[PDB]
């Protein structure tokens, strides 16, 4: 559910 820190940079 929760996107990672670097989900698009």
């Amino acid at each position, epitope marked *: *559910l*929760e*996107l*990672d*820190k*670097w*989900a698009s*940079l």
Partner: antibody
Amino acid sequence: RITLKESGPPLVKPTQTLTLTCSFSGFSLSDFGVGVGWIRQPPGKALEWLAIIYSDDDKRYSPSLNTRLTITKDTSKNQVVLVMTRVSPVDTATYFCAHRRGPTTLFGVPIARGPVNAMDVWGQGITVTISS
Amino acid sequence: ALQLTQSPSSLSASVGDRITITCRASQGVTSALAWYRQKPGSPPQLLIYDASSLESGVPSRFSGSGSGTEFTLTISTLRPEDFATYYCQQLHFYPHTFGGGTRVDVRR
């Protein structure tokens, strides 16, 4: 060369609080986008992600253990501390801290995020047994 | 951490053999997938990051591919130190997750 090493109590009793310390070298938690995370591995079972903390102090926790975990970093001492409250026998496991790279930058510009897609270096791990 | 199914959970093999391990995710994780090898009594060791990139220092026999919900790790020529447990890890969503692991042992 990056190295991490976990330290803490090898034995803790149920309901007590478990404080684990990750001492590292080869990188700084002031370095751009760098992360240090914690993974545990109950004897014989699979790896389980617990939490991660980044250079900018951004923090994330396993939703299942969120209420019992606190991760903090001490930039100056090159350490990351993970505190797990109210431990129980099911928390007996080998706990590893690991390094996560930040995006590759060129003259200060992140040009590649590929390297953040892994925990590239792990500590030897610390075995913690919870028994009364 | 998140839902990733490795297959097979157990695999028998012999030195020189070519093996592949698959990891399927419950939802697309783009290329944010890492493969690790864990030898008995040691910590996991990064093999492949970002689904197909080879971690420096890791032998070329290892390679990974796939994207979205299907990834594979293949060891072209199994070596003695490759009889271990392999895990995939998704880093696209929090909590980052590991697969259940794939045990690779000596066939007989």
